[PDB]
């Protein structure tokens, strides 16, 4: 019977009420541009590192691969490090881990260049097999 309760409006997005104090200016535009421009600039740098080896290419690969992969994994991490599925703090801990990944990647590459054969050399040596 109609002895029941007063109800509220269904949940609905008011796109004008959202405009009442939506200042934030945070263009990810330029960053998206460099990420792509940097990858475009790495197109020649792959065949280059095939034909010309050494300790200076080893350094250019390491600087370039580090900075590229840094952006790369940050993106993958944001697709699979979702607060919905992992909860808030663990998703921030996965985010932080992205930076650990970048910084450890470089450390381990510089080490391999300096105190071992180097990237371009290590490739030859598996190719010689």
């Amino acid at each position: 019977t109609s002895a029941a309760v007063t109800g509220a409006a269904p949940p609905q997005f008011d796109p004008i009420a959202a405009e009442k104090g939506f200042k934030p200016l945070h263009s990810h535009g330029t960053l998206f541009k460099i990420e792509r421009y940097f990858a475009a600039a790495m197109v020649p740098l792959i065949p280059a590192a095939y034909f010309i080896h050494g300790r200076e290419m080893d350094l250019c690969l390491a600087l370039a691969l580090t900075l590229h992969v840094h952006w790369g994994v940050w993106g993958v991490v944001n697709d699979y490090g979702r607060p919905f599925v992992l909860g808030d703090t663990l998703a921030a801990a996965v985010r932080v881990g992205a930076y650990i990944f970048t910084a450890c990647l470089l450390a381990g590459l510089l080490y391999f260049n300096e105190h071992d054969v180097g990237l371009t050399r290590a490739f030859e040596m598996v190719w010689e097999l």
């Binding site: 939506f22 945070h26 792959i46 994994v73 450890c104 990647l105 381990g108 105190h115 071992d116 097999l129």
Partner: protein, 153 residues
């Protein structure tokens, strides 16, 4: 800092959790297609190449082992020649494909080649050339090394 809709969207997802509603299947049910299989590959490769560089980089530093003994170890295993060029091809393909496909996806970011034929040409092309180049780079030295095993000179 989220947009107002992104705040709204979050609450939505929470409301949905509250209602104990299932999520409709996706990966397990969606048709494999040249679209998302190749972007699937672009992510796999990019990540496996990262992973290798990190494991490889940090591994050979944290272990007392060096690269030269590691190369010597598997040589000492005296494994068949064809199988060794397969491992080389697997190493080379990810580099060839991801690089090639990377320019394809940059084209997509610029709205180039996004019609369905183009999509499917660039997919076969980029996938085809990658395989081609990886074969060339694995088989060219082995043709140059069998040119010394038996040879005119």
């Amino acid at each position: 800092e989220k947009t107002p809709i992104q705040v709204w969207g979050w609450d939505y997802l929470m409301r949905q959790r509250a209602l104990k509603r299932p999520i409709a299947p996706h990966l397990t049910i969606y048709k494999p297609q040249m679209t998302w299989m190749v972007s699937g590959l672009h992510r796999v490769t990019g990540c496996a190449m990262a992973g290798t560089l990190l494991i490889g980089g940090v591994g050979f530093s944290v272990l007392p082992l060096d690269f030269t003994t590691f190369v010597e170890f598997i040589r000492g295993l005296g494994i068949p020649w064809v199988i060794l060029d397969t491992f080389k091809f697997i190493i080379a393909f990810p580099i060839a494909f991801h690089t090639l496909n990377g320019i394809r996806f940059i084209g997509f970011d610029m709205a180039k080649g996004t019609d369905i034929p183009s999509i499917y040409r660039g997919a076969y092309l980029v996938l085809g050339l990658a395989a081609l180049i990886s074969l060339a780079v694995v088989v060219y030295p082995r043709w140059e090394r069998h040119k010394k095993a038996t040879l005119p000179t």
